[PDB]
């Protein structure tokens, strides 16, 4: 049936995946013990959880996700958390050594002896699955262990399974903030390796996530908890179609068909319009018009891109809650009448709507609003090529002065692969204006 | 009727027989005294024990086994144990002198004056028995007392009783671990003596039993108590056909006919699929598919052989518990669809299934799981010859430099018998080859 498997590689990607399952157990009302109250939803594992959890005759929900990391500190800590009884011990694949931010160390030195184990997990999860539309991969481009390990496993799952979908989600590197200077080194290594195998990649940047927090959420001092709950809401919204239904039901297969124009570039942008603090939503009203203005207001994007400097290709909107096609179609029509919205002439239509009646729920101990009508806005524009334009002039300098190469060549590589990525990157930009130029 | 006699030779083979009888009384609920409660099961010796125990009008269940040993240390201690009242005193056949690992010392020096005694025991056991399908022999190859004494007695019981089955079970010598350098001496001596008389020799290796313990049982420091329990479960599963019925009932005679293809080679491999920890089985589910995957997973074999380096001839699975033909026949059909498992083209069908309804129970103070569906996997493959291939290149070096020969020629022997066995082995590998050649 309609189920999937999630992947969370790296200490970066494990705390966020933890929050998602924390959120996911909430709307399903899953108790931290592992079982419901005297009410009956258990069986052969076939209900709203059959797509996410695995609650067999034992009555314990087994989430369909694998957490892999190379350092035991955080994973053992969450192994001592609140839902650890729910979590499968060796689905929480731990490690004893790190990649030291080195792409190839996590790709050559240690990834060999651990991938065989996780493949057993994948196949032993594959057999119990029925339809398994695809995979939910959560990582980070600046992965000290997320980057290198994922590149190894993603091609391994691609070569044996090239018939099903693979969904990619990672933090985009901060355009002007760098907590690591080898991060641009490994990031371009991941991109050029993933471009020919990654199906649909989606990125996000924390700075504007922070910027939103003190703009409208009005929190000048949030924490990761807020960051994880926001993206957890994002993945919840895209997965609500799997959980509930609405006016029309849409699937990732429709998303991949209706978003990516051509091969290579598969990098659209997600956005959630009703990001507002609580105290506001009491005394104002929400409707499709303003949130449509909000989701298309450029400053509400979490990626530092000026859409006026680019051109729109596709726009996929997922209205979760009580909406009607009438105001929807009328409002988006006014958007089409807008002149500043410069779509490419190649797309007469570029709108992909998915309706779900279920209202978005608040989280206990949270800071969000009380949303009845919500949209997660998925779109791809040509204003993104500047981001890679930032990386290459960042990249070309240090490669020319070949910093830290002694580290990389010290444990066994050469610069030719670093050479390949540069025209792999270069081919990306030249393509972007070529498709950008009508 | 459906009964058998068990034989336990070697102070190595004595503790395992104790554990099996310890296990055997639990599913029968036998109290250590020797009698059930006031409930009515005693009689002329006819109930579930009749195939194993001898609970006559005296009301005391007498196991149909013979413990034979030559060092009174362990046998006296177990005679001070818990069920010693159940055990028959001179059925606990003891000796006052050892064989010093020497096969022929245990085959010539002292075995002559004791075999007549045990011969009296077997006939006095034979007369009381009714059908006595065959014998159950626990022994060892590298036996300080297991090797030499068993060889003489199996010669004597074969010539007078050559019309019934004899079931052989010995710990296979560890390939790269050696507790004694004379172990190759007696081991190949035993093999060449047994090949023309032994009916069904089944081998195990402790290393992988240990390897299993910290893979899935997750015990880094187990003991023999666990080791004997694991093999004790194995013999329990094969004997469950005698204890209970099933969807179909299978017997060693069917096992003998359907397993061994051709004379000489009668050396299959056994494997128990649901070996897992209590908590793992607690929040996980067992079904025919994944356990069928597990039993054919190469690392789950207790013998260090790669089936991809060999080819399959016979495969017997003994499903114990609540199972149906539907999933089982479909699963094995999918197994036949698998390409990696390379059966020989000679056998289109090589799958012998024995269904038993009785679920495998847990043991008090044990480490096993709560199994409802279990299978004992008996199979024979050509990947076994590497073991003897390992054996011979160890022997050929050592026989060339004739180490320890003064020990053997000192107490009565020569080199011809040692010479004779090596071409027997050299026959074994060459016989193992053309059968592997299609």
């Amino acid at each position: 049936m309609r189920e999937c498997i999630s992947i969370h590689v790296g200490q970066a990607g494990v705390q966020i995946g933890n929050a998602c399952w924390e959120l996911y157990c909430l709307e399903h009302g899953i108790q931290p013990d592992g079982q419901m109250p005297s009410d009956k939803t258990i069986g052969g594992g076939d209900d709203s959880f059959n797509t996410f959890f695995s609650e067999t005759g034992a009555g314990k929900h087994v989430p369909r996700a694998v957490f892999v990391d190379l350092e035991p500190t955080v994973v053992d800590e969450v192994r001592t958390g609140t839902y650890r009884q729910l979590f499968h011990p060796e689905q929480l694949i731990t490690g004893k050594e790190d990649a030291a931010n080195n792409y190839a160390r996590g790709h050559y030195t240690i990834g060999k002896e651990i991938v065989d184990l996780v493949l057993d997990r994948i196949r032993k999860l594959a057999d119990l699955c029925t339809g398994l539309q695809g995979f939910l991969i959560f990582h980070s481009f600046g992965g000290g262990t997320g980057s290198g390990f994922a590149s190894l496993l993603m091609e391994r799952l691609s070569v044996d399974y090239g018939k099903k979908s693979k969904l990619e989600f990672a933090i985009y590197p901060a355009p002007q903030v760098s907590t690591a200077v080898v991060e641009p080194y490994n990031s371009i290594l991941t991109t050029h390796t993933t471009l020919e195998h990654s199906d649909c990649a989606f990125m996000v940047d924390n700075e504007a996530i922070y910027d939103i927090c003190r703009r409208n959420l009005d929190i000048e001092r949030p924490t990761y908890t807020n960051l994880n709950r926001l993206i957890g809401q994002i993945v919840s919204s895209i997965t609500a179609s799997l959980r509930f239904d609405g006016a029309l039901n849409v699937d990732l297969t429709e998303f991949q068909t209706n978003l990516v124009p051509y091969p290579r570039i598969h990098f659209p942008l997600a956005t959630y319009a009703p990001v507002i603090s609580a105290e506001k939503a009491y005394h104002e009203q929400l409707s499709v018009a303003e949130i449509t203005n909000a989701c298309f207001e450029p400053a509400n994007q979490m990626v530092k891109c000026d859409p006026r400097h680019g051109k729109y290709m596709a726009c996929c909107m997922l209205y979760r809650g009580d909406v009607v096609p009438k105001d929807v179609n009328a409002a988006i029509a006014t958007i089409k009448t807008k002149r500043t919205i410069q779509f490419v002439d190649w797309c007469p239509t570029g709108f992909k709507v998915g309706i779900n009646y279920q209202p978005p729920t608040v989280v206990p101990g949270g800071d969000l609003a009380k949303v009845q009508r919500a949209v997660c806005m998925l779109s791809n524009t040509t204003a993104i090529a500047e981001a890679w334009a930032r990386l290459d002039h960042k990249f070309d300098l240090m490669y020319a002065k070949r910093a830290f190469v002694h580290w990389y060549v010290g444990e066994g590589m050469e610069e030719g692969e670093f050479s390949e990525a540069r025209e792999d990157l270069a081919a990306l930009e030249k393509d972007y204006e070529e498709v950008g130029v009508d | 009727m459906r009964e058998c006699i068990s034989i336990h030779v070697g102070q190595a083979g004595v503790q395992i027989g104790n554990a099996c009888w310890e296990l055997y009384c639990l599913e029968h609920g036998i109290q250590p005294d020797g009698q059930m409660p006031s409930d009515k099961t005693i009689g002329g010796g006819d109930d579930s024990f009749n195939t194993f125990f001898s609970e006559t009008g005296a009301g005391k269940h007498v196991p149909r086994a013979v413990f034979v040993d030559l060092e009174p240390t362990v046998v006296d201690e177990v005679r001070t144990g818990t069920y010693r009242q159940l055990f028959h005193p001179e059925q606990l056949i003891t000796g006052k002198e050892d064989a010093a690992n020497n096969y022929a010392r245990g085959h010539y020096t002292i075995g002559k004056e004791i075999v007549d005694l045990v011969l009296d025991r077997i006939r006095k056991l034979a007369d009381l028995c009714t059908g006595l399908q065959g014998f159950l022999i626990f022994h060892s190859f590298g036996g300080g007392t297991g090797s030499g004494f068993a060889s003489l007695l199996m010669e004597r019981l074969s010539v007078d009783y050559g019309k019934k089955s004899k079931l052989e079970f010995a710990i296979y010598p560890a390939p790269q671990v050696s507790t004694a350098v004379v172990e190759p001496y007696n081991s190949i001596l035993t093999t060449h003596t047994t090949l023309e008389h032994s009916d069904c020799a089944f081998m195990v290796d402790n290393e992988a039993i240990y390897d299993i313990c910290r893979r899935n049982l997750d015990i880094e420091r187990p003991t023999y108590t666990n080791l004997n329990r694991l093999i004790g479960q194995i013999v329990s599963s094969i004997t469950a056909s005698l204890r209970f019925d099933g969807a179909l009932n299978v017997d060693l005679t069917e096992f003998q006919t359907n397993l061994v293809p051709y004379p000489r080679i009668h050396f299959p491999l056994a494997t128990y699929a649901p070996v897992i920890s209590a908590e793992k089985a607690y929040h996980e589910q067992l079904s025919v598919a994944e356990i069928t995957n597990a039993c054919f997973e190469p690392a789950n074999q207790m013998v260090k052989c790669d089936p991809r380096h060999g080819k399959y001839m016979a495969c017997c699975m003994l499903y114990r518990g609540d199972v149906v033909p539907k999933d089982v026949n479909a699963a094995i059909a999918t197994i036949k669809t698998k390409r990696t498992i390379q059966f020989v083209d000679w056998c289109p069908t090589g799958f012998k299934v024995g269904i038993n309804y009785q679920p495998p129970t847990v043991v008090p103070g044990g480490d096993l799981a709560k199994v409802q569906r279990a299978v004992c996997m008996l199979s024979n493959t050509t990947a076994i010859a590497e073991a003897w291939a390992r054996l011979d290149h160890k022997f050929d070096l050592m026989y060339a430099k004739r180490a320890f020969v003064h020990w053997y020629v000192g107490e009565g022997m020569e080199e011809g018998e040692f010479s004779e066995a090596r071409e027997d082995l050299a026959a074994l590998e060459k016989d193992y080859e053309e059968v592997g050649v299609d």
């Binding site: - | 201690e77 006052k96 010093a100 050696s178 180490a403 320890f404 020990w407």
Partner: protein, 427 residues
């Protein structure tokens, strides 16, 4: 049932035999008077391997004492356990030794060998079936060397069917005190290698080095040295007397350690030795036991086998261990120094694990070594013999006794044959 009768010889054996036996009584908890205080059931089963029964729960040690000088026995008798030894088992002579080996081998032994044979067969008939015998003495010990060579030869044709152990201490290489000692040792070893099968090699200098290393107590008593080696000697005997899944018979052991007949000489090895504060500074783990077990410093027998290679190794572990750690420890050391063994035989290890700890500690062990480290020993004595045989020093005595230089020729030639034999097998 299979038992052992002990032979006490030499004036060194006078001290070790007392120390060796009192440890056993203390280990089994018998009071000095001899009335057993029932505390341990396993020792309540297995003193019959070594002791017979006296009236009133008294346990006669089945050992025989032999010497010439009465004062040594009187000190032994006036010891803490002289009462538990028998005046029946005290055979001696009416002569002073002067540790002329020939006198004890030809002159003094003749009128005493008859009596000692009578006593031992009386003891031998008192018991049912032996594994065999063991002897405590010194190879360079004058009166002990003279008597044993006679006794070992006599008991050869007597009972050529039993376990024929020998426990001798090597004199100090740096100084032998006795200057005719190299004559005494060379004479004895000629017949020893003919008559013996097992030989323990012990040297005092190494024991002196051990005291400087772990005992660290400046000035010890020779009894403390006797305490160490008696414990090692007791350890190899613990395996017989105690239960647990480990194989006990020395023949179970000897065939595994002895590849060729001429191999009789063996190097002991013992387990944790602890210093001033390390009792409360040590975490007892099989890894650190295994490390300390295979330490050239922990060695005490002859000298460092580092200069050579390892033929056979056998270590018995005493206490609450398991089959897995001993297995992985053997693999670790197997991989640790793979080259330092001989390519003739791999997996040259023979492991036994005694589940019963000693009284006071839980995890202990003992090791017996057969490596290429004995060459320098008889190489050392080779120069001494040749130098002293170069100009027949101190020789008129033995000619007066009735000895001739021809005997000395084959004794060294026998020794020289061993030099090539040990060399040829490894080098």
């Amino acid at each position: 049932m299979r038992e052992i009768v002990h032979l006490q010889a030499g004036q060194c054996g006078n001290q070790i035999g007392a120390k060796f036996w009192e440890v056993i009584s203390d280990e089994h908890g018998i009071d000095p008077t001899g009335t057993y205080h029932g505390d341990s059931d396993l020792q309540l089963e297995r003193i019959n391997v070594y002791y017979n029964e006296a009236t009133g729960g008294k346990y006669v040690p089945r050992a025989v004492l032999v010497d010439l000088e009465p004062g040594t026995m009187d000190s032994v008798r006036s010891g803490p356990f002289g009462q538990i030894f028998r005046p029946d088992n005290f055979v001696f002579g009416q002569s002073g030794a002067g540790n002329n080996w020939a006198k004890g081998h030809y002159t003094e032994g003749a009128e005493l060998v008859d009596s000692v044979l009578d006593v031992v067969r009386k003891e031998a008939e008192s018991c049912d079936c032996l594994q065999g015998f063991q002897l405590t003495h010194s190879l360079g010990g004058g009166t002990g060397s003279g008597m044993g060579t006679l006794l070992i030869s006599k008991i050869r044709e007597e009972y050529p069917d039993r376990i024929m152990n020998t426990f001798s201490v090597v004199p100090s290489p740096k100084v032998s005190d006795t200057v005719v000692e190299p004559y005494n040792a060379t004479l004895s070893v000629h017949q020893l290698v003919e008559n013996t099968d097992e030989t323990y090699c012990i040297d005092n200098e190494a024991l002196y080095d051990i005291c400087f290393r772990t005992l660290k107590l400046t000035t010890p008593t020779y009894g403390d040295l006797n305490h160490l080696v008696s414990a090692t000697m007791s350890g190899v005997t613990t395996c017989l007397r105690f239960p647990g899944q480990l194989n006990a018979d020395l023949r179970k052991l000897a065939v595994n350690m002895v590849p060729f007949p001429r191999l009789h000489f063996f190097m002991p090895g013992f387990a944790p030795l602890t210093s001033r504060g390390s009792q409360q500074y040590r975490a007892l783990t099989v890894p650190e036991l295994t490390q300390q077990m295979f330490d050239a410093k922990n060695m005490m027998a002859a000298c460092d086998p580092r200069h050579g290679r390892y033929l056979t190794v056998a270590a018995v572990f005493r206490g609450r261990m398991s089959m897995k750690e001993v297995d992985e420890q053997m693999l670790n050391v197997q991989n640790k120094n793979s080259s330092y063994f001989v390519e003739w035989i791999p997996n040259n290890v023979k492991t036994a694990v005694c589940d019963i700890p000693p009284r006071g500690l839980k995890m202990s062990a003992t090791f017996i070594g057969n490596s290429t480290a004995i060459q320098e020993l008889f190489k050392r004595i080779s120069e001494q013999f040749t130098a002293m045989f170069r100009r027949k020093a101190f020789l008129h005595w033995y000619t007066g006794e009735g000895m001739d230089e021809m005997e000395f020729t084959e004794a060294e030639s026998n020794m020289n044959d061993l030099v090539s034999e040990y060399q040829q097998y490894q080098d």
